[PDB]
């Protein structure tokens, strides 16, 4: 009684699931070959990023012992990146399998204390990257909930966009890096909130008369603005 | 030719992906949904109404708010059944044995 | 009125809405004041379908 007879058609018919498998098992069914994802991009640890940090490009320090070899983003990518899907793009900035900095706690109270002091969340440390399908499902559910909350709201799509950008930037595992990307949409939502309040509650101001040199040149057109 | 997509352009990449030999329905990508809160919400609502766990599990039903079905499955029914018959008989359409049915389906769906 | 002017007094599509700098306008709104509020001195309007 052999185990898994009908379960490896990839082996029976020489079908590679990916170019790495193709290169390994020598099926040679990928015309363009394979450029291997190096190990520093396949795995690694969280690092500091800003140039205004003294420990820049250095691994993040945790209460637990952790390998200090860092994930290196793709800074000099090749011109032709044949797969421009999210699957192949995400590997340039995060490792798909997550970082290698996760703990195995010898006790429950260590876990408790780390969480209590803000140095551990399983959401963050025992997790992979999210797939495009997962991101889209989350975004669409959130959009449905927001539309149900209020259709006649102008900041709707802005809230949806900040959610979308956080999900795409993988804020579960890199929240500070993602907030750095999404605070612009938060700021735009903050503006839209006041613009809506001032339209609902009629707020206006006495505008001054027109300036003597509103036009720089007499032959120039003074395009009227609301 | 296929240049790198920076991280700032990924939100547009998710809903307007590049062209492939196997593309999705970009017009329907905002309609793909799968609720992880369906059964928890159902249980919470029923237990708040006052039912027991057994009654809730008997009354539970799976979510209808999922990704919509392909209309080709209802419009191209006979063509698809014939193609699957051809494939089952001819070993998956090796050396172009189901090209007849596949081309008929492609023409019907595309129209130049 | 703007939507009708664009679509030539003919049947427009469903759930069509106007936006300026990401901010959706109500249909019973004055375009001038809505632009003054949402997009001051950037009157670029966009017409989109709001299904959601």
């Amino acid at each position: 009684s052999i185990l898994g007879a009908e379960a490896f058609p990839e082996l029976l018919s020489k079908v590679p699931l990916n170019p790495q498998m193709d290169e390994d098992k020598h099926f040679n069914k990928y015309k363009w070959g394979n450029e291997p994802i190096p190990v520093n991009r396949r795995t690694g640890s969280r690092m500091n990023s800003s140039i205004y940090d003294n420990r820049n490009h250095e691994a993040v320090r945790h209460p637990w012992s952790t390998d200090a070899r860092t994930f290196h983003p793709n800074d000099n990518p090749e011109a032709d990146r044949i797969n421009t899907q999210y699957s192949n793009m995400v590997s340039d900035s995060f490792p798909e399998g997550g970082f290698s900095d996760a703990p195995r706690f010898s006790s429950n109270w260590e876990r408790l204390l780390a969480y209590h002091h803000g140095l551990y969340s399983p959401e963050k440390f025992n997790s992979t990257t999210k797939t495009a399908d997962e991101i889209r499902l989350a975004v669409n559910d959130f959009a449905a909930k927001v539309h149900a909350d209020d259709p006649k709201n102008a900041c709707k799509y802005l809230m949806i966009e900040e959610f979308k950008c956080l999900q795409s930037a993988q804020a579960r595992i890199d929240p500070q890096g993602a907030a750095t990307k999404c605070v612009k949409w938060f700021n735009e939502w903050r503006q839209c909130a006041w613009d809506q309040e001032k339209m609902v509650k009629g707020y206006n101001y006495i505008e001054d008369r027109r300036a003597r040199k509103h036009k720089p040149y007499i032959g120039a057109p003074d395009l009227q603005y609301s | 030719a296929a240049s790198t997509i920076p991280i700032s352009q990924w939100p547009s990449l998710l809903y307007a992906p590049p062209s492939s030999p196997a593309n999705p329905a970009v017009e329907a990508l905002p309609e793909m949904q799968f609720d992880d809160l369906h059964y928890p919400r159902q249980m919470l609502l029923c237990r708040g109404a006052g039912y027991s766990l057994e009654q809730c599990n008997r009354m539970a039903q799976p979510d209808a708010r999922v990704t919509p079905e392909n209309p080709a499955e209802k419009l191209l029914k006979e063509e698809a059944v014939a193609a699957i018959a051809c494939l089952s008989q001819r070993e998956g359409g090796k050396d172009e044995q189901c090209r007849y049915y596949i081309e008929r389906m492609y023409k019907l769906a595309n129209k130049e | 009125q703007l939507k009708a002017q664009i679509y030539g007094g003919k049947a427009a599509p469903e759930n069509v809405k106007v936006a300026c700098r990401g901010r959706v306008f109500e249909d019973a709104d004055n375009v001038a004041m809505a632009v003054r509020a949402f997009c001051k001195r950037d009157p670029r309007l966009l017409l989109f379908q709001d299904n959601l």
């Binding site: 799509y157 949806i160 966009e161 | 939100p11 547009s12 809903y15 905002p30 | 966009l46 989109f48």
Partner: peptide, 8 residues
């Protein structure tokens, strides 16, 4: 579609 997918 959403208004932010527009760029041009």
């Amino acid at each position: 579609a959403s208004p932010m997918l527009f760029t041009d």
